[PDB]
């Protein structure tokens, strides 16, 4: 029983062997009444011992040894860590290199797969990567909110990468993606005009199309309303580092000329090309369910549904695409389903040796952005939208900071609370002045909007009612204490959820997401909120900050029992006659005018009375 034996050994006094030497003797015999090492001379073995408390003391006050070259010795572990941090995470799909075997636990299950692109030593272009990451995050936040364009602009103006504002990087850096282009159009900047379909970039070079509404049957046997393009057209198509030329007509793909490049880029380009071509041959390849949703909770348009499906399940299309024999000409070749060199090439698809000139000629222009982050040219045709924003996610290489409460939700529920309380404090004077006016509009501020996102929905209304009642008690029928005003102000945003009796719900602690240590004690020093009554310091998550001046002289003598329960005011003292300390359930049931007993903390009993 190694586990139980270890349990007992750790319950022993001095279980750990200790070496002999000056460094070993540097441990004290006992620290603050805790014996750390054995003061016994063994008969023959001369083996000294120590407690785990000795290890903790060494890590707390022990000598600070040199730690140079440590990363050199354990270089493999740090390489693993760097690969993990520099990696990019794609999408997780359900249903049927040594750098990939390391992450196997997080990559492959029995019914799910995790798309994972490892990174490492790709440091030079940090600016562009960080700008892409920030733009993608801004777009993701904006989509889920009403009037996405307004929030996108309001967050884009208050975000900075490293030190430069996001607008400066967008204007200066010529690279980017769909998200960067959307943000540029939102800010009024100029972008290169290219038609987008997912990662696919298209530039029509000939032909004309007239989208028409039609009902189409897919492989799974369901009717869908899709706008179909009729007429022969050609485009210059690019996907990553691979480019080609596509000729297509009504529900048909005629020609597909491409070059040699990264295999995954080729596969993505070819799949996107078939999907865009609207071929009935790829309509009939849908043997599953197409009901994918965007992060906003809406239903994707049919074309993007098919794009997502055939990007996930590529074989379902390459099987139902047919095959042909490519010509034996030197430059003309053929590619199979595995992006290999084989004359048994896909029907209509051919890889070519000659280089296709990149269509990306400088074409900066002013497009118009609609409410839903959709870009439309003066002619009146959508070129790109939110649906085309890549779903890849990574960590920016340069610190990117957004100065707005709408971006706090990306925190860890500890940084969100920190920011909310710091914002409340920085505005404490105005907040208190506005509260002492009979106005309740301050509960609607964006900081409290961000705070609400970490309050469990089931108890948000009850907490709001409790906090509002306590604040009103502190204000109208009594003078306030600043500390508890600060503590309970954030919770007041949500609408009150007073019980049928009309009174609020009493609470001893207020809990938040990811509990265990993320709670706010209504009458004590919680780990997320502490305050020294005499020294006037507010320790929010170990960030002691003074409160001089904001506190008032008269709110120091006042006890803490006056603002700990809604509708209860302190009276008398700790009278051991009514009974023991009452639970909140009994206090809630108490008839008006009756007294009770309360224990604010360990050694501060108090007596209160209902009103």
């Amino acid at each position: 029983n190694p586990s139980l034996r270890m349990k007992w050994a750790m319950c022993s006094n001095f279980p750990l062997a200790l070496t002999k030497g000056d460094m070993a003797n540097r441990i004290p015999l006992e620290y603050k009444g805790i014996q750390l090492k054995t003061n016994a001379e063994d008969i023959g073995t001369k083996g000294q011992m120590c407690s785990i408390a000795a290890v903790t003391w060494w890590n707390t006050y022990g000598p600070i040894g040199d730690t140079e070259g440590f990363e050199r010795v354990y270089e493999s572990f740090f390489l693993r860590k760097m690969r993990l941090d520099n990696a990019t995470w794609g999408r997780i799909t359900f249903g049927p290199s040594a750098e990939f075997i390391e992450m196997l636990h997080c990559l492959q299950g029995e019914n799910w797969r995790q798309i994972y692109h490892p990174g490492g030593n790709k440091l030079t272009e940090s600016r562009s990567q960080s700008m892409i990451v920030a733009c993608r995050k801004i777009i993701r936040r904006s989509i889920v909110a009403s009037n996405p364009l307004e929030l996108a602009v309001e967050i884009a103006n208050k975000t900075v990468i490293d030190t430069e504002p996001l607008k400066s990087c967008l204007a200066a850096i010529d690279g980017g993606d769909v998200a960067c282009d959307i943000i540029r159009a939102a800010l009024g900047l100029k972008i290169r005009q290219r038609q987008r379909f997912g990662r696919l970039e298209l530039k029509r070079i000939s032909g004309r199309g007239f989208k028409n509404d039609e009902e189409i049957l897919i492989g799974n046997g369901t009717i869908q309303k899709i706008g179909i393009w009729d007429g022969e057209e050609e485009f210059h198509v690019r996907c990553g580092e691979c480019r080609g030329i596509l000729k297509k007509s009504k529900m048909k793909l005629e020609k597909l000329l491409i070059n040699s490049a990264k295999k995954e880029d080729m596969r993505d380009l070819i799949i996107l090309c078939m999907v865009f071509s609207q071929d009935t041959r790829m309509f009939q390849g849908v043997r599953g369910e197409i009901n994918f949703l965007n992060r906003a909770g809406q239903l994707l348009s049919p074309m993007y549904q098919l794009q997502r499906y055939f990007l996930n399940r590529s074989n379902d299309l390459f099987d139902q695409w047919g095959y042909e024999e490519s010509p034996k000409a030197s430059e003309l070749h053929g590619i199979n389903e595995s992006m290999n060199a084989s004359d048994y090439t896909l029907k209509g698809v051919v890889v070519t040796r000659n280089v296709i000139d990149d269509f990306s000629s400088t074409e900066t222009e002013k497009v118009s952005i609609t409410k839903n982050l959709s870009l439309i040219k003066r002619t009146g045709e959508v070129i790109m939208g939110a649906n085309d924003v890549s779903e890849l996610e990574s960590q920016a290489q340069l610190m990117i900071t957004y100065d707005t409460p709408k971006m706090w939700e990306m925190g860890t529920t500890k940084e969100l609370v920190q920011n909310t309380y710091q914002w409340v404090l920085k505005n404490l004077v105005t907040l208190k002045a506005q509260f002492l006016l009979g106005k309740e509009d301050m509960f609607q501020w964006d900081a409290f909007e961000a705070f609400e996102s970490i309050i469990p929905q089931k108890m948000a209304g009850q907490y709001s009612g409790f906090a509002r009642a306590v604040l009103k008690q502190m204000r109208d029928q009594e003078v306030m204490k600043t500390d508890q005003f600060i503590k309970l102000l954030p919770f007041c945003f949500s609408p009150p959820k007073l019980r049928s009796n009309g009174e609020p719900y009493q609470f001893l602690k207020l809990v938040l997401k990811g509990g265990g240590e993320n709670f706010i004690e209504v009458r004590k020093g919680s780990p997320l909120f502490s305050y020294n009554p005499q020294t006037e310091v507010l320790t929010i998550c170990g960030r002691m900050m003074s409160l001089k001046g904001k506190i008032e002289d008269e709110e120091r003598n006042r006890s803490m029992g006056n603002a700990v329960l809604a509708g209860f005011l302190v009276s008398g003292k700790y009278d051991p006659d009514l009974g023991d300390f009452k639970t909140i359930e009994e206090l809630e049931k108490l008839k008006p005018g009756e007294k009770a007993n309360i224990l604010l903390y360990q050694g501060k009993p108090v007596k209160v009375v209902k009103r």
Partner: protein
């Protein structure tokens, strides 16, 4: 190691040598010397074969070479090429795998690298092989030994010797000459002779129809057994068959139809602690951990009328039990908990000794006396009773699946989520705890786990004296108040032995409110007193004490503590359900399953029956029922339940095939039913599982018609 190998040898040779070593060695990286030898051998083979060419008729200049390289390739194909060459050229196939095959003389070639000297390793190779194949021997020091004059000429000899010399110089000047290993150490062992006894054992171990092993060997080596299987199947009796039948719904009948018979006894309660009838003495605290003795002391002080009752008002009695001694032991427990001493030992050994029946044990005698004594006979096995359905199991499942006002689960935190899979896991955990936090079964499970771990800790730490283990549990309500709960006291026996399986008697006194007389057949193992009354919300309720003498062992204590894995089991079952739901789609369905999206409505589950009608519920209620089912499966676990769960799986999969219309076929349906029904004797969970299985099967049969 790898640096020199990479520098001095090309990539293809290195990878071929690595594959060859990996074919027979499972730790190629741990012994680089073998890699060195293999790569050197392959380089020498290529030197011999790469440059020497031939032509159609006899020209030793087209593209035909006079050497075939059989080394450096997988054995599966090397053996094919060797056998094909031997058959085509009319020459015997050597029992070993050759390195090269010579086309000018049609003879297999063996090439070795001798560290010491040639003409000695040559004779060792000759002894190992013999006249089967020729030999070409080259040594690190300039020397050679060949078995033929028309073999490799001087031009190849120069290149191979230079190749060896460069490696020798590098090893000498880089301190790695100590790692070199000769091929003799690899050839070590070819002389295996069978003694007389083992040979005779071999002679008599041949199948029927063979005199000695030599006849068996020759018959195996020389006979063509083609057509034997059909020959033996032709004359096999038709009575040997699988007898398959197409399963139908009508072929599925209720399992264990004797549970419905009313003349049988009903299953009693036999779990260690009261699961649903438990009563806890709540005492608010600030959350600080307390020793269990102090917790019990304070919880008893808060309820003085129950601690200070010294007279038993007996309500029920187990046929053997001695209610007076049980009450005296309970008073001893209550008096020892309240004392000022820091120990939970019952120093009054009298009633603990006389209650656990420790004075009515059997003793051992000599085997000779037992053999002489005719009155000594082996006891008949205790046949489990054949009981019927008890409604209290249904009530217990109903109650344990409801939400309480207290929660006993407080799990630590984990690092922030960065990957979509981690976000999926976090969402699933959020929903699971939101539905399972306040479930009654969760608090009951935590009480079980805490009690069993407390027993184990006290068991082997202090086994020799009767300790009292408070049946405690820390819970928190929705208002953040932390209550200490005492559900009873459990005096733990003492075992004179120290084995892990040795039995220790544990008498448990548990509070309760339910009147034992309402369901008399549930409590035949319990003596029930009445200790007082309690007030909860202005309503008076009686309080009873359930005394029972139980037994367990360190193994069972560990099993009970491990009962906490029901949480992980329920999480995994929920994950399987959600993964199956999402596999139909391509995206996760946790939120849609629990809350419901715009395209997906919230998922409703069938939870039970109300007056013979189906009633649906939410995924949260189904989750609570799943957790309760796992908890009861663990609590009521034994050999019968294990076998029932293992065997009814096949019947359930047959019903799944019938529902999916997969046309199942059965070879022995009555054998399946008998295997399932041989485990339904007296386990309450097994009997209730049979009852529920029959009810669900009736519902499925009714639904199949529509």
């Amino acid at each position: 190691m790898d640096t020199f190998i990479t520098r001095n040898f090309q990539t293809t040779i290195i990878q071929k040598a690595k594959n060859t070593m990996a074919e027979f060695s499972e730790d190629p990286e741990l012994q680089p010397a073998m890699l060195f030898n293999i790569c050197v051998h392959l380089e020498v083979c290529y030197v011999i074969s790469d440059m020497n060419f031939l032509d159609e008729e006899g020209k030793a200049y087209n593209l035909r070479p006079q050497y075939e390289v059989i080394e450096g390739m997988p054995r599966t194909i090397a053996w094919m090429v060797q056998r094909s060459l031997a058959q085509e050229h009319g020459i015997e196939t050597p029992k070993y795998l050759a390195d090269l095959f010579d086309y000018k003389t049609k003879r297999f070639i063996e090439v070795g690298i001798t560290k010491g000297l040639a003409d000695d390793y040559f004779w060792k190779k000759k002894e190992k092989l013999g006249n089967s194949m020729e030999l070409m021997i080259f040594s690190y020091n300039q020397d050679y030994s060949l078995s033929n004059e028309s073999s490799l000429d001087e031009e190849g000899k120069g290149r191979v010797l230079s190749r060896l010399t460069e490696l020798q110089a590098e090893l000498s000047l880089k301190n790695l000459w100590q790692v070199l290993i000769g091929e003799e150490d690899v050839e070590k062992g070819i002389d295996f002779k069978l003694g007389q006894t083992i040979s005779r054992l071999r002679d008599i171990s041949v199948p029927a129809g063979f005199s000695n092993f030599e006849g068996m060997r020759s018959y195996i080596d020389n006979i063509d057994p083609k057509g034997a299987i059909e020959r033996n199947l032709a004359r096999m009796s038709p009575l040997v068959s699988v007898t398959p039948k197409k399963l139908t719904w009508e072929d599925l009948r209720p399992i264990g139809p004797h549970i419905y018979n009313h003349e049988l006894p009903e299953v009693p309660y036999n779990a260690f602690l009261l699961m649903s009838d438990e009563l806890g003495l709540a005492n608010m605290t600030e959350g600080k951990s307390k020793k269990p003795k102090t917790l019990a002391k304070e919880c008893l002080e808060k309820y003085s009328t129950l601690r200070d009752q010294t007279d038993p008002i007996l309500i029920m009695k187990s046929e053997k039990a001695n209610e007076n001694f049980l009450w005296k032991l309970w008073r001893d427990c209550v008096n020892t908990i309240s004392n000022e001493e820091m120990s939970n030992e019952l120093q009054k050994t009298n009633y603990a000794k006389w209650a656990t029946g420790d004075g009515l044990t059997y003793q051992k005698i000599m085997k000779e006396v037992a053999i002489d004594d005719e009155t000594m006979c082996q006891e008949e096995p205790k046949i489990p009773n054949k009981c019927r359905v008890a409604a209290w199991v249904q009530t217990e499942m109903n109650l344990l699946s409801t939400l309480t006002s207290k929660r006993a689960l407080d799990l630590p935190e984990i690092g922030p989520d960065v990957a979509p899979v981690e976000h999926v896991g976090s969402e699933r955990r959020k929903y699971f705890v939101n539905e399972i936090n306040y479930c009654k079964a969760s608090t009951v499970m935590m009480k079980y786990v805490l009690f069993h771990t407390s027993l184990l800790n006290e068991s082997n730490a202090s086994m020799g004296k009767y300790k009292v283990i408070p049946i405690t549990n820390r819970v928190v309500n929705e208002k953040g108040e932390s209550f200490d709960m005492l559900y009873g006291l459990a005096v733990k026996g003492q075992s004179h032995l120290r084995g892990d399986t040795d039995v220790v008697t544990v008498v448990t006194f548990e509070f309760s409110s339910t009147d034992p007389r309402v369901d008399s057949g549930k409590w035949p193992k319990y003596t029930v007193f009445r200790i007082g009354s309690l007030f909860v919300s202005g309503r008076e309720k009686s309080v009873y004490l359930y005394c029972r003498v139980n037994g367990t062992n360190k193994i069972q204590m560990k099993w009970g503590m491990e009962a906490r894995r029901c949480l992980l089991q329920s999480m995994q079952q929920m994950e399987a359900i959600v993964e199956q739901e999402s596999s139909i789609q391509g995206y996760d369905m946790t939120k849609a399953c629990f809350k419901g999206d715009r395209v997906n409505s919230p998922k409703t589950f069938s939870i039970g029956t109300q007056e013979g009608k189906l009633v649906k519920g939410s995924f949260g209620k189904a989750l609570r029922v799943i957790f309760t089912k796992c908890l009861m499966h663990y609590v009521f676990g034994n050999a019968q339940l294990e076998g029932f769960s293992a065997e009814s799986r096949r019947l359930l999969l047959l019903i799944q095939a019938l529902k999916d219309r997969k046309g199942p076929w059965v070879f022995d349906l009555e054998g399946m039913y008998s295997g399932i029904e041989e485990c339904i004797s007296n386990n309450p969970w097994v009997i209730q599982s049979a009852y529920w299985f029959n009810e669900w099967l009736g519902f499925e049969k009714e639904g199949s018609k529509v």
